From Swiss-Prot, chain A:
Miscellaneous comment text of the record: MDM2 RING finger mutations that failed to ubiquitinate p53 in vitro did not target p53 for degradation when expressed in cells.
Residue ranges of every copy of the SWIB/MDM2 domain listed in the record: 11-94
Gene behind the chain: MDM2
Disease: Seems to be amplified in certain tumors (including soft tissue sarcomas, osteosarcomas and gliomas). A higher frequency of splice variants lacking p53 binding domain sequences was found in late-stage and high-grade ovarian and bladder carcinomas. Four of the splice variants show loss of p53 binding. Lessel-Kubisch syndrome: An autosomal recessive progeroid syndrome characterized by short stature, pinched facial features, prematurely gray hair, scleroderma-like skin changes, small kidneys and consecutive kidney failure, followed by severe arterial hypertension.
Comment text on domains: Region I is sufficient for binding p53 and inhibiting its G1 arrest and apoptosis functions. It also binds p73 and E2F1. Region II contains most of a central acidic region required for interaction with ribosomal protein L5 and a putative C4-type zinc finger. The RING finger domain which coordinates two molecules of zinc interacts specifically with RNA whether or not zinc is present and mediates the heterooligomerization with MDM4. It is also essential for its ubiquitin ligase E3 activity toward p53 and itself.
Identification of the protein by name: E3 ubiquitin-protein ligase Mdm2
Compartment annotation: Nucleus, Nucleoplasm; Cytoplasm; Nucleus, Nucleolus; Nucleus
Part of the full-length chain shown: 17 to 112 of 491
Amino acid sequence: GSQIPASEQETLVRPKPLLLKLLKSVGAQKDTYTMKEVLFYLGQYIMTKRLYDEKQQHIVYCSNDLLGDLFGVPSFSVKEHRKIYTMIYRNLVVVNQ
Amino acid sequence: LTFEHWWAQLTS
């Protein structure tokens, strides 16, 4: 299933300002998280704003969203696990690996 | 097929 090792999913991170604001918009309460929590809130964010395509729900559109500015892409496929993590890492600092 | 189905696969 997941293309990301479980151990990496437990990496402790400190999101940068903009990403932090995005997570807090959906309930996030901390300054540091594990990647698993970052991915949880990010999912809630996309689900809530309905950024995914209705017909092909793995396609996410973000050209007119803060998420687009954060990922540097107009859209992406949820199926590209490694690519999503890579885009996420540029918006945070790794605390403990 | 749903967004959450696909999204849930990223996490083990």
